[PDB]
Design a protein around this nucleic acid. Structure first.
Lengths: 222, 226
DNA sequence: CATTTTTATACTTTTTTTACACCC
DNA sequence: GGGTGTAAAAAAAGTATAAAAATG
């Protein structure tokens, strides 16, 4: 039916204008003013498309794109005040699908929106032990009943699974789960790795899928 | 592992530019000088991506896109010297996946190519392995195998093995490698190297007493083979 | 209230130290 | 005998888990 579009934008005027324009084209519109709320709404609302303004202060748009790409393949169209090539390349390599420099023609945006939308196999499941993981749907089934992970736990699991077979350093896991401002706190990582092992391993005391690489970091297997 | 990009372009300057851009980050280039030739090769050569210049004189590029879209869903990125948005909208509605207007940089072009290609051509190619005897080493994944089984190395052992692997055949002095494994403060502690090379030897060699890959250069340092 | 962060303590791995055999 | 290879300790660094305090 109607396409669900999530708009992460801090400027009120642009939010209203875009809401008018996109609702006029027959799309259900959701907005977020911050990146964290935008990620939250991305998880809960499951939009078919995300418009993201890089001019958001509270965090980093690239960080948003990466965090989102840890589990979601939803098309992301970025709008920006800058038109510097380095920013385009960075955003696109982070996982963005398109880039527009402000100001732009609304018709062009509608066009690229249609292009992004019309590009749409079931979700890849990761199976190990008796656990079934669906990253795209953010659901995990141990055995046959759903097991609940907290936001940090799920992000950690997503990072580990996306790098299946490869060991990740504590710096990497911390940077990708908590962020750049908390890379000295390896104990966070120990604790939450503990949570994951507790919830998912058949024997939390002796892991067979969430392996400790002593002195380095951690690694998911199978 | 190569991406087959077909460029539809007649002007030699832009074609040169596109060739340097495409060969820039490891791709293969098919060329077509007319729209008809473009369709023909689009079918016969099965490109992973088509870069199409709308500046082509032989006909309408948008109708090229419409004709192509009747039997192919290959990504097409459209180039243009104009920037009138109606042309953009027409091209995108026609079936194009992206639209670049002058002036386009080589970097942004390459980036957008990567974007258009990572939808289908993304299959996660296995990490490159370093092999000798029945030992397998994945530097990226930080995992070592010996036979079917997995061999665990401690961090220092791994740093050492990595440095040795990077310098296969070359003779390393104890000083310059102590400066690379431990650091610039244990440069005289040449006893650590002995016991730890002993660890690499008994962990990896078939006969740890008679090393085939971890050879010692008495007086100067060590040297790794294979 | 669920969740994250701080706090405290038992535990395991790795590094360094220190020891005794080697060998042309 | 200077330079080199196994083995075992003592020392240092790193890890697991619980549980209370803080966050919003």
């Amino acid at each position: 039916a109607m396409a669900n579009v999530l708009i992460v934008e801090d400027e009120q005027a642009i939010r209203r204008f875009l809401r008018t324009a996109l609702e006029g084209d027959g799309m259900r519109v959701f907005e977020a003013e911050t990146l964290q709320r935008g990620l939250l709404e991305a998880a809960t609302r499951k939009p078919d498309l995300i418009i993201l303004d890089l001019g958001l202060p509270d965090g980093d748009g690239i960080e948003f794109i990466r965090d989102l790409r840890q589990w979601s393949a939803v098309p992301v169209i970025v709008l920006s005040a800058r038109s510097e090539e380095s920013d385009k390349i960075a955003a696109l390599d982070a996982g963005a699908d398109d880039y527009l420099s402000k100001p732009f023609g609304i018709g062009e945006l509608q066009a690229r929106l249609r292009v992004a939308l019309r590009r749409h196999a079931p979700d890849p499941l990761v199976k190990f032990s008796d656990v079934t993981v669906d990253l795209a749907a953010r659901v995990i089934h141990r055995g046959e009943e759903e097991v609940h992970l907290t936001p940090i736990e799920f992000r950690l699991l997503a990072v580990l699974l996306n790098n299946a077979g490869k060991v990740l350093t504590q710096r990497q896991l911390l940077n990708q789960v908590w962020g750049p401002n908390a890379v000295e706190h390896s104990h966070y990582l120990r604790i939450y790795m503990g949570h994951l092992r507790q919830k998912l391993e058949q024997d939390p005391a002796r892991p067979r899928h969430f392996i400790t690489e002593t002195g380095i970091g951690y690694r998911f297997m199978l």
